[PDB]
């Protein structure tokens, strides 16, 4: 029942039930009666015209062109241009901002986040003729060719990842629609439930700012408040006295996502929304220039996801695959999440659901997965709000439950939400200001990294998050943060020859007993690690947890062998361009040899594989790439051996026999690090031994859930991988270790038609492998630590050129 007299867009929300005057009161139905009148003035528009100059202050107007307006901080943004012969910010040549140029009483440069919904990366080039302000920010500041959103590429997961540096599985907003079985409640876009704190995990920037005594603009805007009013409110706040003025502000545009849904990413109707966005960027920058803040403020221009072409006719229906579609609830669209419609119903069975959706039609436009089998690069499993069954939907398609759902809910021509590697889902980043570099292009990066940077730009300490602090230092002219290498926790043992053959009772056999001062002196040095400079190019990986392990040297490879897990944690080898592929000689098919540097009790044994009818075994260093007939015997040590389902042996064998040699050919040598991963609780983090759910039958040999490889070479491919003088190039994958090849609909064909495709799907960052293994790679290089962190966050996507 109170008033907004003197409180328009107040910075601290008042306590109920007293009427509010902040930028969120409309959204709550709690604004004061006089809010529209005082706080949402519209009279005469947003632009000073040639006959408003010098006017007599009329308080009814949206903005002002009177003489006192500069003092009141409430001029129209073009006031100086129309009235005082000033130029627009965009018409001025851009001058490097080598230091902040701020008015007295600014403790730090303000940060302004300008986030735009559905702003696809290619808009920067394709719409460049109609966005001269955005294009000036882009070419004068720092920009990436594009920014990778998180999965699912929806609005709320992505804007909250931008604010927290966390994966949605961690922050808890895992879609635009959710059901939380613990709270027994649902989250929807439309509604009031979305405003309930318990949905929102982690610690977003504005709460981080406040706990550390940095004042934050009320970030969020009720939808009806026009963009021009949003801008003038931000400029008004920038004129508050120093003890009241916030240090960070956010502006959000519903465009071009809104129009993109109706017309498609490139519909001719899309030119106008892009013009309007630019017009708003113009207004801000002219307003900052009026305030003399245009060389003081850091501006971030940032999208949450792109937009793809999607129409009604490209819908796949679960009714065409399942009889009894009514026993399920589907969260539909560009992804699918399936649960049981009722919990008292216990004839529902997920195993049978997946089977009925697996490779059922020649042209099938979605693939079912249990969430824990999804590619690890999506990080989309460790949350009770993520349904066990998940449908990865092809770009350009929708999934729905029944046809009735589509024609009664064509209407739309664009959508988003797909796999975050998809070109059309990529978005933008431009940073402009004293803290950002001048005319700098940086490589593409993931939006999870920005929370640390925004914290850096504000002199704040980030809450723990999924960014890699320091990986984006190359954006910044000056950085608060200088990262340091984590300390090694366990140091290795270097065993010598300690055991006699006959002490081993492993049920292993080898046709080996056919073999001299020449090459026994040589193999002695091979076991001391003579060729180790060749095979271990960037130093040994550090182990960052408490464990017992051995470094084992060989002619062709080096490994860190775990006495706890009975297998290597990592194996490292170099394959030059000139190296040859040989076969496994017939007599050595089944050869496994005891390793006399490791005790029987810390060794695997061949019997358990004999007795485990579902489980076989493979090697980490591939015997196919042994450098000589003699070196080949090393490849058959029991300590190079790991458990593999026969179905996965097809995959692995093809990688080792064919793909490794191909990459060495194409890249001029490669260094390969391979190993097992254990993630039974699907949290993207290394399991301890008491978390292992599967052992090779009647033995303490744990079964990995995944196998990784990290393949490194020289970015300058004219240099060989073992002789690189410069930056490195990397690709990695995390392959799921599965007893069938149901994932690949073409598996019954030759490996040359499906294996590489599978590997591409399971591409990973070296950083993903680090979390999953507790190792730290690239410890000894000539490169700067910041450059290495960037390499570790790199993802090889196998999409074409944007
Ligand atoms: C990406 O980055 C993130 C963030 O860094 C990584 O996620 C973190 O990972 C940690 C290790 O897994 C995990 O540690 C947990 O913490 C449990 C308690 O956590 C609660 O408190 C958190 C802190 O909030 C406060 O933050 C600051 C301090 O920093 C304070 O000043 C404030 O006061 C804040 O309140 C909080 O973040 C967390 O939030 C979760 O839950 C909320 C409400 O339910 C949700 O809103 C929110 O979304 C979070 O939910 C996520 O996390 C949970 C798992 O925590 C997950 O299930 C969800 O899916 C979702 O993803 C909490 O409120 C603590 O219980 C754990 O301790 C157990 O394990 C240790 C092992 O050392 C034992 O020693 C210990 O005794 C204990 O075991 C006992 O309980 C066990 C299980 O119940 C049981 O088995 C056993 O028998 C024992 O009795 C552990 O320390 C962080 O919580 C987590 N943080 C976040 C934000 O998720 C993530 O790993 C990264 N991803 C990758 C791939 O790298
Ligand atoms: O005015 C709005 N601000 C926002 N959203 C709106 C959605 C509809 C109408 C208005 C709004 C969606 C959103 C979701 C989750 C987290 C932040 C935001 C958000 C801005 C933002 C601020 C700071 C950062 Br950092 C990132 C995003
Ligand atoms: Ca785990
Ligand atoms: K077997
Ligand atoms: Na198959
Ligand atoms: Zn949208």
Swiss-Prot record:
Question: What residues are glycosylation sites in this protein?
Answer: 344, 356, 466, 746
Q: Where is this region: Nuclease-like domain?
A: 537-802
Pfam families tied to this protein = Endonuclease_NS, Phosphodiest, Somatomedin_B
Annotated 1-hexadecanoyl-sn-glycero-3-phosphate binding lies at: 155, 176, 257, 416
Task: Please provide, in alphabetical order, the Gene Ontology terms of the cellular component aspect for this entry.
Answer: extracellular space; membrane
Annotated catalytic residues = 155 (nucleophile)
Q: Where does Ca(2+) bind?
A: 679, 681, 683, 685, 687
Site note Essential for catalytic activity applies to 792
Q: Where does 1-tetradecanoyl-sn-glycerol 3-phosphate bind?
A: 155, 176, 257, 416
Q: Which GO terms describe its biological process?
A: cell chemotaxis; cellular response to cadmium ion; cellular response to estradiol stimulus; estrous cycle; immune response; negative regulation of cell-matrix adhesion; phosphatidylcholine catabolic process; phospholipid catabolic process
Note on cofactor: Binds 2 Zn(2+) ions per subunit.
Q: In which tissues is it expressed?
A: Abundantly expressed in cerebrum and cerebellum. Localized in secretory epithelial cells in the brain and the eye including choroid plexus epithelial cells, ciliary epithelial cells, iris pigment epithelial cells, and retinal pigment cells.
MF (Gene Ontology): alkylglycerophosphoethanolamine phosphodiesterase activity; calcium ion binding; lysophospholipase activity; nucleic acid binding; phosphodiesterase I activity; phospholipase D activity; polysaccharide binding; scavenger receptor activity
Q: Where is the SMB domain?
A: 1-43, 44-88
- Enzyme class (EC, first level): hydrolase
Where do the segments described as Phosphodiesterase lie? Answer: 90-443
Give the residue interval(s) assigned to the motif Cell attachment site.
72-74
Keywords carried by this UniProt record? Calcium, Chemotaxis, Cleavage on pair of basic residues, Disulfide bond, Glycoprotein, Hydrolase, Lipid degradation, Lipid metabolism, Metal-binding, Obesity, Repeat, Secreted, Signal, Zinc
Q: How is its activity regulated?
A: Inhibited by vanadate. Inhibited by micromolar levels of bile salts, such as tauroursodeoxycholate. Not inhibited by taurodeoxycholate. Not inhibited by hydroxysterols, such as 7-hydroxycholesterol, testosterone, dexamethasone and prednisolone. Inhibited by EDTA and EGTA.
Which amino acid positions bind Zn(2+) 1, per UniProt? 117, 155, 304-305
Major localization listed first in the record, in broad terms: secreted
What is the recorded phenotype of mutating residue 155 to A? Abolishes lysophospholipase D activity
Per the UniProt entry, the effect of residue 376 to A is: Impaired secretion. No effect on lysophospholipase activity
Q: What is known of its domains?
A: The nuclease-like domain is most probably catalytically inactive as residues that are essential for catalysis in the DNA/RNA non-specific endonucleases are not conserved. However, it is required for the stability of the protein and the catalytic activity born by the Phosphodiesterase domain.
What this protein is called in its record is Autotaxin
- Which source organism does the UniProt entry give? Rattus norvegicus
The lineage is: Eukaryota, Metazoa, Chordata, Craniata, Vertebrata
Whichever gene encodes this chain, its name is Enpp2
């Amino acid at each position: 029942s109170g008033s907004c007299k003197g409180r328009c867009f107040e910075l601290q929300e008042v306590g109920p039930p007293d009427c509010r005057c902040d930028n969120l009161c409309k959204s709550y139905s709690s604004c004061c009666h006089d809010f529209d009148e005082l706080c949402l003035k519209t009279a005469r528009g947003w632009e000073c015209t040639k006959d408003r100059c010098g006017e007599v202050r009329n308080e009814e107007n949206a903005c002002h062109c009177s003489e006192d307006c500069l003092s009141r901080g409430d001029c129209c943004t073009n006031y100086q241009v129309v009235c005082k012969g000033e130029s627009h910010w965009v018409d001025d040549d851009c001058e490097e901002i080598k230091v902040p140029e701020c008015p007295a009483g600014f403790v730090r440069p303000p940060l302004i986040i300008f986030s735009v919904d559905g702003f696809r990366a290619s808009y920067m080039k394709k719409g460049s003729k109609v966005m001269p302000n955005i294009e000036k920010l882009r070419s004068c500041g720092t920009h990436a060719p594009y920014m990778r959103p998180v999965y699912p590429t929806k609005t709320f997961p992505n804007l909250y990842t931008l604010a927290t540096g966390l994966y949605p599985e961690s922050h808890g907003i895992v879609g635009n629609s959710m059901y939380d079985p613990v709270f027994d409640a649902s989250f929807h876009l439309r509604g009031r439930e979305k405003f309930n704190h318990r949905w929102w995990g982690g610690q977003p920037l504005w709460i981080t700012a406040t706990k550390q005594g940095v004042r934050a603009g009320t970030f969020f805007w009720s939808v009806s408040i026009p963009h021009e009013r949003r801008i003038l409110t931000i400029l008004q706040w920038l004129s508050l006295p120093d003890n009241e003025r916030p240090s960070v502000y956010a502006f959000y545009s519903e465009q071009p996502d809104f129009s993109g849904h109706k017309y498609g990413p490139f519909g001719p109707e899309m030119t106008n929304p892009l013009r309007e966005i630019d017009k708003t960027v113009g207004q801000l920058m002219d307003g900052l220039k009026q305030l003399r803040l245009h060389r003081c403020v850091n501006v971030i221009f940032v999208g949450d996801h792109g937009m793809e072409d999607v129409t009604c006719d490209r819908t796949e229906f679960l009714s065409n695959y399942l009889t009894n579609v009514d026993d399920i609830t589907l969260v539909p669209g560009t992804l699918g999440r399936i649960r049981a419609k009722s919990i008292n119903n216990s004839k529902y069975d997920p195993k049978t659901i997946i089977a009925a959706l697996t490779c059922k039609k020649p042209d099938q436009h979605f693939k079912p997965y249990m969430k824990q089998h999804l590619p690890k690069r999506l990080h989309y499993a460790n949350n009770r709000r993520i349904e066990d069954i998940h449908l990865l939907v092809d770009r350009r398609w929708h999934v729905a439950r029944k046809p009735l759902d589509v024609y009664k809910k064509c209407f739309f021509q664009g959508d988003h939400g797909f796999d975050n590697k998809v070109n059309s889902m990529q978005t933008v980043f431009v940073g402009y200001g004293p803290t950002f570099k001048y005319r700098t292009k940086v490589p593409p990066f993931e939006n999870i990294e920005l929370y640390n940077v925004m914290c850096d730009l504000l002199g704040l300490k980030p809450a723990p998050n999924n960014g890699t602090h320091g990986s984006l230092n190359h954006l910044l002219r000056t950085n608060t943060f200088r990262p340091t290498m984590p300390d090694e926790v366990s140091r290795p043992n270097y065993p010598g020859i300690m055991y006699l053959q006959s002490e081993f009772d492993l049920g292993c056999t080898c046709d080996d007993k056919v073999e001299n001062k020449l090459e026994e002196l040589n193999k002695r040095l091979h076991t001391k690690g003579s060729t180790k400079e060749r095979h271990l190019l960037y130093g040994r990986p550090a182990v960052l947890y408490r464990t017992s392990y051995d470094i084992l040297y060989h002619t062709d490879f080096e490994s860190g062998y775990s006495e706890i897990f009975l297998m290597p944690l990592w194996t490292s080898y170099t394959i030059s361009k000139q190296a040859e592929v040989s076969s496994i000689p017939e007599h050595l098919t089944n050869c496994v040899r005891p390793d006399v540097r490791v005790s029987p009790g810390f060794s695997q044994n061949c019997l358990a594989y004999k007795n485990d009818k579902q489980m076989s075994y493979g090697f980490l260093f591939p015997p196919y790439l042994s450098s000589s007939p003699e070196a080949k015997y090393d490849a058959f040590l029991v300590t190079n051996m790991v458990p593999m389902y026969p179905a996965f042996k097809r995959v692995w064998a093809y990688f080792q026999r064919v793909l490794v040699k191909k990459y060495a050919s194409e890249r001029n040598g490669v260094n390969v690090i391979s190993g097992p991963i254990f993630d039974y609780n699907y949290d993207g983090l290394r399991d301890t031994e008491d978390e292992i759910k599967q052992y090779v039958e009647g033995s303490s040999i744990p079964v990995p859930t995944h196998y990784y490889s990290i393949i490194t070479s020289c970015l300058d491919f004219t240099q060989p991988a073992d002789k690189c003088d410069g930056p490195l190039s990397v690709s990695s994958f995390i392959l799921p270790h599965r007893p069938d090849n149901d994932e690949s609909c073409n598996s019954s064909e030759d490996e040359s038609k499906w294996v590489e495709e599978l590997m591409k799907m399971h591409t990973a960052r070296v950083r993903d492998i680090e979390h999953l293994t507790g190792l730290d790679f690239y410890r000894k290089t000539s490169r700067s630590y910041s450059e290495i962190l960037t390499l570790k966050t790199y993802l090889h996507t196998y999409e074409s050129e944007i």
